[PDB]
C-alpha cells in the first residue's frame, strides 16, 4: 500500500473507494505562499502539483 499521490496533491476523485491510503495532512502556510526554509523536516506538508499517471 502507498499513500495516494492524487490525495497528496489534494484531490482524489475515487474518495473512499481508492486502493491507495488517503492520509489527511495539514499544508505549510509558507510553502503555500511560495517558500519554506524548513524543507523535508518541515512539520507541515509541501504538496506538489505534478499529476501522477
Partner 1 sequence: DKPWRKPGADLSDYFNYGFNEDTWKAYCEKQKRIRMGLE
Spatial distance between the Cα atoms of 15 and 24, rounded to a whole number of angstroms: 12
Q: Which is nearer to partner 1, 48 or 52 (CB)?
A: 48
- Binding of residue 19 to partner 1 (CB under 8 A): no
Other residues' Cβ atoms within 10 Å of the Cβ of residue 2: 9
- Binding of residue 37 to partner 1 (CB under 8 A): yes
C-alpha distance from residue 1 to each of 5, 28, 41 (Å): 12, 25, 23
Among 3, 18, 32, 52, binds Zn ion (CB under 5 A): 18
- Binding of residue 45 to Zn ion (CB under 5 A): no
- Binding of residue 7 to Zn ion (CB under 5 A): yes
Amino acid at each position: 500500500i502507498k499513500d495516494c499521490p492524487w490525495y497528496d496533491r489534494g484531490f482524489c476523485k475515487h474518495g473512499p473507494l481508492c486502493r491507495h491510503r488517503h492520509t489527511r495532512r495539514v499544508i505549510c502556510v509558507n510553502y503555500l505562499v511560495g517558500f519554506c526554509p524548513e524543507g523535508p523536516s518541515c512539520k507541515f506538508m509541501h504538496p506538489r502539483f505534478e499529476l501522477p499517471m
